[PDB]
Amino acid sequence: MNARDNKFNTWNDSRGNYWSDYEGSDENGDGIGDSAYAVNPEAGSMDYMPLMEYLHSSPVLPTARFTSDITEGFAPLSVRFKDFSENATSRLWMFGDGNTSDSPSPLHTFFNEGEYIVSLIVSNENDSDSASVTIRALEHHHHHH
């Protein structure tokens, strides 16, 4: 049995009401109107081209022409060929023996008969012309009844 005098009480108290406000109002705009006009009059439809035509320049070419002494008959001993080569640089006599153009005789001796073909051929810087004729030397006693 004893006595004790004690009183206990603890006071803690916190009070406060705090707040903030967002203040954010700002404007920034942009813009630009640009017009552009170039002065273009018309289109360049400008075209000029003249015409000069010439004619066809007609060239001259040779002609190998000749006459045979006989055309048909008995084979003779003198058959002179007369050439009528026109527009020719040179006339070439081709018999088929040895050389050519240089013939020792304008007349030829047919020692036998037969059907020959003589060809005169001429040459020129433009063209060359050759023509042949059938030399008909008839065989003796060849027509049998």
UniProtKB/TrEMBL annotation:
Presence of keyword RNA-binding: no
Domain PKD, residue spans: 93-135
Membrane listed as a keyword: yes
Alphabetic keyword roster: Membrane, Transmembrane, Transmembrane helix
Domain of life according to the entry: Archaea
Protein name listed in UniProt: PKD domain-containing protein
Organism: Methanosarcina mazei (strain ATCC BAA-159 / DSM 3647 / Goe1 / Go1 / JCM 11833 / OCM 88) (Methanosarcina frisia)
Organism lineage: Archaea, Methanobacteriati, Methanobacteriota, Stenosarchaea group, Methanomicrobia
